[PDB]
Design a protein around this ligand. Structure first.
Ligand SMILES: NC(=O)c1ccc[n+]([C@@H]2O[C@H](COP(=O)([O-])OP(=O)(O)OC[C@H]3O[C@@H](n4cnc5c(N)ncnc54)[C@H](OP(=O)(O)O)[C@@H]3O)[C@@H](O)[C@H]2O)c1
Ligand SMILES: NC(=O)c1ccc[n+]([C@@H]2O[C@H](COP(=O)([O-])OP(=O)(O)OC[C@H]3O[C@@H](n4cnc5c(N)ncnc54)[C@H](OP(=O)(O)O)[C@@H]3O)[C@@H](O)[C@H]2O)c1
Ligand SMILES: NC(N)=NCCCC(=O)C(=O)O
Ligand SMILES: NC(N)=NCCCC(=O)C(=O)O
Ligand SMILES: NC(N)=NCCCC(=O)C(=O)O
Ligand SMILES: NC(N)=NCCCC(=O)C(=O)O
Lengths: 312, 312
């Protein structure tokens, strides 16, 4: 087999060599403009149309969890990826645990009122605060996928009430499963903490807006770990200023880097991280890719596969 | 049986009634100065010498995890508590989980560099930071008791390397156990995060001082959940200012409320909470007390028992 690799910023030389070692019968090369030699598999992030167009690839592996960008490019350039070509993404490969670290830390942080204690510390003010209780701290997860489920799991340990929202029904024993737009209002109504792990799709763009935030209980918290386009930033600022939302921690933004003019930077109840919630673990990604290729070859049934019609 | 109850600040009436219901053959009363009627058991916090002196009680239950204060008072007033009287404290009764919430939240917070990202947010500065790795993030727990073990357990989930320090050897499978002063230097040498869950005793007063902090790896973090007297605050400020300690989160202080003149309040790498790490859960405390009384009565072997000679 022949494998072509393209990534705008990764250590191309490291990846190529790691893939050779993990698939020793594989000839692996970095794709450059003009390379129209044969390829069986393509490993890509933000690929040029030229790299894929007209290739009857056996599979394409997106080097990310999200496939927002590549699907949107195929819409604009249908010539780019023949419908025969199966599209895979990176499922977990270490991002699950990273999402769990971030959510558990911050849910507990809000639950123990470390935000209030920091404000009082800023005035040298010593004042014990009433403890919150779990019954009033339901955690809702928008999106119940590879990452949502991992996060739900790691929060169940702490005995918070849990609910999730998705297109289709889930069976997780401790987690009340809400499905479809018809059930979104009910889902939102009890969510003291709302965690966004949705994919970026036309159906979810701007879903976190005024109408959604108004259905939340008062003094809610928002943790956006998914995509910036899910949030209407001005509606969120209004919810923060009205006290509807007590705190928001955001890792992703409509424009990244978030430009200095955004009021989010200096807003008091907002915490910002620069899209670092869960990054690729290269060795685990190389493991997932070689394993998937091996499974495709043995005719075994494989899962981590994008549905282009569905959008994710 | 007759039970006398004293607490300077708790809801005396609630506690009395809850104890009646949990021990329905018990006559329970609030102790007031001059009450020299008979008592079988005394439930106390910061008790007047008069309340206990000369009583041949069947047991005394301190309504706290720490027995610093009551043992120090018996030193000053040996007439207060006959050596025949067994002394119990509150073991766990919900404080374990509270310690786990606080430690897991904050260990993860430092491990994901949320402190650095907050500083960059304060300048509207967008800059992804190199991820820390577990091998460089050994967590050491000073004190390996009811609370230390609970905290160790909840951190093992996250795959941090773990070590604990105590007087006597521990057997916890994933946790390297250090014992005695002769092994303290070795224990400290790898501790990226140091968590203090020691009791307040003459042997541990001021243990966190210049000599201890110097043995820590650079860029260490201190989480003091035990007693303020364990820390020499000026040595810690010097370690913070030299960069030896990257961050400290403190719940307990030599003087509480921490007076406004302390430099800890406004120091940049210091986080303060007003002694709220783990508070009594009254219903669970009433459960532990009635259960222990029942066990003492059945001649069953009981554990949660202070060794007055040892100091804890
Ligand atoms: N911040 C970061 O660093 C970072 C890192 C990695 C990933 N991410 C983001 O996290 C996202 C989720 O990753 P994942 O691996 O968990 O994706 P996934 O496994 O595909 O799960 C997506 C979930 O969203 C639900 N969903 C999709 N469209 C929906 C709709 N219209 N209504 C209701 N629910 C809908 C799906 O429902 P069904 O189960 O019913 O299909 C599914 O449960 C990625 O798409 C990426 O944008 C961010
Ligand atoms: N911040 C708060 O809100 C809060 C709440 C509750 C408790 N606390 C504090 O937490 C402390 C610990 O509670 P706990 O229930 O875990 O106590 P514990 O079960 O009695 O455990 C104490 C541990 O400290 C160790 N230790 C005692 N003296 C030592 C010495 N000289 N050298 C080395 N190790 C020593 C003991 O060693 P061995 O196992 O060898 O005996 C034991 O492992 C309490 O005393 C209290 O001060 C604080
Ligand atoms: N795991 C760490 N430290 N970064 C994640 C992605 C970087 C990468 O794959 C490359 O640039 O070669
Ligand atoms: N969209 C761009 N440029 N980077 C995303 C990287 C991490 C992530 O969120 C994922 O892999 O899904
Ligand atoms: N659990 C909560 N909310 N506080 C802890 C101790 C208060 C208490 O026991 C009393 O004053 O009666
Ligand atoms: N020492 C005083 N006044 N209060 C302590 C209360 C909580 C605690 O740390 C414990 O129960 O050990």
């Amino acid at each position: 087999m022949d494998i072509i690799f393209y990534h705008p910023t990764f250590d191309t030389q490291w990846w190529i060599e790691a893939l050779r070692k993990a698939i020793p019968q594989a000839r692996v090369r970095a794709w450059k403009s003009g390379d129209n030699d044969s390829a069986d598999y393509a490993l890509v992030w933000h690929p040029p149309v030229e790299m894929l167009a007209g290739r009857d690839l056996k599979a394409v592996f997106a080097l990310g969890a999200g496939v927002d960008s590549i699907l949107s490019k195929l819409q604009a350039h249908p010539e780019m990826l023949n419908p025969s070509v199966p599209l895979f993404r990176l499922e977990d490969t270490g991002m699950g645990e990273q999402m769990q670290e971030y959510a558990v830390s911050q849910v507990l942080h809000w639950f123990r009122r470390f935000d209030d204690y920091r404000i009082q510390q800023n005035s040298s003010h010593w004042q014990p605060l009433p403890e919150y209780h779990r019954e009033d701290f339901t955690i809702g997860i928008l999106g119940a996928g590879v990452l949502g489920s991992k996060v739900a799991q790691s929060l169940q340990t702490w005995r918070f009430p849990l609910r999730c929202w998705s297109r289709t029904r889930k069976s997780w024993p401790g987690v009340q499963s809400f499905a479809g737009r018809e059930e979104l209002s009910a889902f939102l109504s009890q969510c003291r903490v709302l965690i966004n792990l949705l994919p970026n799709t036309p159906e979810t763009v701007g879903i976190i807006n005024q109408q959604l935030l108004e259905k939340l209980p008062d003094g809610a918290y928002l943790l956006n770990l998914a995509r910036g386009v899910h949030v209407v930033e001005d509606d969120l600022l209004a919810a923060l200023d009205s006290g509807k939302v007590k705190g928001a921690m955001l890792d992703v933004f409509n424009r990244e880097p978030l430009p200095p003019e955004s009021p989010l930077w200096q807003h008091p109840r907002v915490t910002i991280t620069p899209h670092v919630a869960a990054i690729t673990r290269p060795a685990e990604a190389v493991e997932y890719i070689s394993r998937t290729i091996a499974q495709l070859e043995k005719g075994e049934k494989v899962c981590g596969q994008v549905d282009r019609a569905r959008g994710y």
